[PDB]
Design a protein around this ligand. Structure first.
Ligand SMILES: CC(=O)SCCNC(=O)CCNC(=O)[C@H](O)C(C)(C)COP(=O)(O)OP(=O)(O)OC[C@H]1O[C@@H](n2cnc3c(N)ncnc32)[C@H](O)[C@@H]1OP(=O)(O)O
Length: 209
């Protein structure tokens, strides 16, 4: 029904510290709200529009309903909603979405990291260990991601792990007040001679931990 969920993933050491993944939970409300509120202008240009004011969307009281919905999707096997931890503390999220099995065995992957912790290899490590989990525990064959061509930092993260560009999706997602083109990138399990974590370690971008 939902292989590889729930689970913890990692840890991996990067310059910023020790990175792991674990399920969203109700007590994340305080840290999720504090960081998303404080990071509004770093996140809003790169996030799907919600049709809500940013500050009402990200109040502490908004989290239980969001967390409940994510876990409901997860127990139906359609999502894996992880929190990125740095040294045991909430610093972002890594979400595997639109999970299918059958003859497709594919999903998309998305992420964000608190701006004060960026440039330390966290998103790259989160993505690598998320991918490795999908290609083992979740029994998936393929992971895709969509990213605005303008989102040069996220494209760097995806390139670190080996994603291939597959297409350009015109007017794909409502972001920052308009329908924006998104690149489509992908990677399949048979493209990994080595795990994504192992690839990071060999490149000097992470260490075993
Ligand atoms: C598939 C998706 O989810 S698309 C949306 C991704 N999420 C967002 O854009 C939300 C807002 N931004 C963020 O959350 C973060 O800034 C992220 C997720 C993009 C990056 O998180 P980080 O922890 O800093 O990533 P990490 O350190 O592993 O790699 C970032 C790399 O991009 C580099 N980089 C940063 N800014 C730029 C830039 N303007 N141009 C080129 N490279 C850049 C960084 O230096 C780093 O590469 P390096 O170590 O070789 O120098």
């Amino acid at each position: 029904m939902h292989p590889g969920w729930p689970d913890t993933v990692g840890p991996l050491r990067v310059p910023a510290g020790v990175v792991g993944l674990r399920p969203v939970r109700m007590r994340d409300a305080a840290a999720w709200s504090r960081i998303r509120l404080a990071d509004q202008h770093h996140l809003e240009p790169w996030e799907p529009m919600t049709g809500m004011d940013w500050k009402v969307r990200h109040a502490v009281t908004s989290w239980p309903s969001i967390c409940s919905g994510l876990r409901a999707e997860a127990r139906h096997g359609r999502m894996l909603p992880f929190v990125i931890e740095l040294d045991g503390e909430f610093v972002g999220q890594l979400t595997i979405g639109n999970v299918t099995h059958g003859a497709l065995r594919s999903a998309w992957i998305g992420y964000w990291v608190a701006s004060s912790r960026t440039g330390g290899g966290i998103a790259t490590a989160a993505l690598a260990m998320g991918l490795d989990h999908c290609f083992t525990a979740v029994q998936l064959h393929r992971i895709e991601a969509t990213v605005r061509p303008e989102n040069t930092p996220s494209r760097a993260v995806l390139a670190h792990v080996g994603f291939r560009e597959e297409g350009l999706l015109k007017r794909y997602l409502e972001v920052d007040g308009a329908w924006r083109d998104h690149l489509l990138v992908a990677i399949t399990a048979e493209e990994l001679p080595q795990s994504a974590a192992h690839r990071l370690v060999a490149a000097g971008r992470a260490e075993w931990c």
